[PDB]
Design a protein around this ligand. Sequence first.
Ligand SMILES: Nc1nc2c(ncn2[C@@H]2O[C@@H]3COP(=O)(O)O[C@H]4[C@@H](O)[C@H](n5cnc6c(=O)[nH]c(N)nc65)O[C@@H]4COP(=O)(O)O[C@H]3[C@H]2O)c(=O)[nH]1
Length: 163
Amino acid sequence: MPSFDIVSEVDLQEARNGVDNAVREVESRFDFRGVEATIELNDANKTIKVLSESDFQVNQLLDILRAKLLKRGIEGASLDVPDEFVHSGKTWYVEAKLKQGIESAVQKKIVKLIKDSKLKVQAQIQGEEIRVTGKSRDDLQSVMALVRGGDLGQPFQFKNFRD
Ligand SMILES: Nc1nc2c(ncn2[C@@H]2O[C@@H]3COP(=O)(O)O[C@H]4[C@@H](O)[C@H](n5cnc6c(=O)[nH]c(N)nc65)O[C@@H]4COP(=O)(O)O[C@H]3[C@H]2O)c(=O)[nH]1
């Protein structure tokens, strides 16, 4: 009874290091000297708030944070940036969501998408991931390519291959 796990992981310590290093980089940049510019990781909600004084400077901070994150092994696709920036007072900010684990809403689409493929596999939501089982190892490879090549909004890896 072959099975594997569909997971979406980011080492949160590496993320914190990226933020820490993005902050040290902003403090060196003299286009930001004496400019309100902050990057704060909320480790409860898996979110990074980046705030500055213009929407242009917010994107500058996001690009710095993404560069630092990539070097720590975290890919830009793991940092969900919402459509709307917030204009509050003389500040601009956005809450960027770190896509660690597969949220309930995305698990449903993965399970639905696997259903509509007609492959003889079962897909069971388990904690923060999806276990997939079936009798054919090759059908199990087809769902990997199906998930890989989906636009699901997030990187996935596959772990825990069992027979
Ligand atoms: N982008 C920008 N920010 C400004 C400006 N003026 C003041 N600030 C901000 O306000 C901080 C304190 O300025 P300060 O009281 O004169 O206290 C400063 C000041 O006494 C001196 N300093 C730094 N740069 C200069 C300079 O270019 N000329 C002179 N005469 N002193 C400087 O060293 C202190 C610490 O400097 P900072 O750490 O950078 O921290 C500075 C800086 O972040 C400005 O014209 N442009």
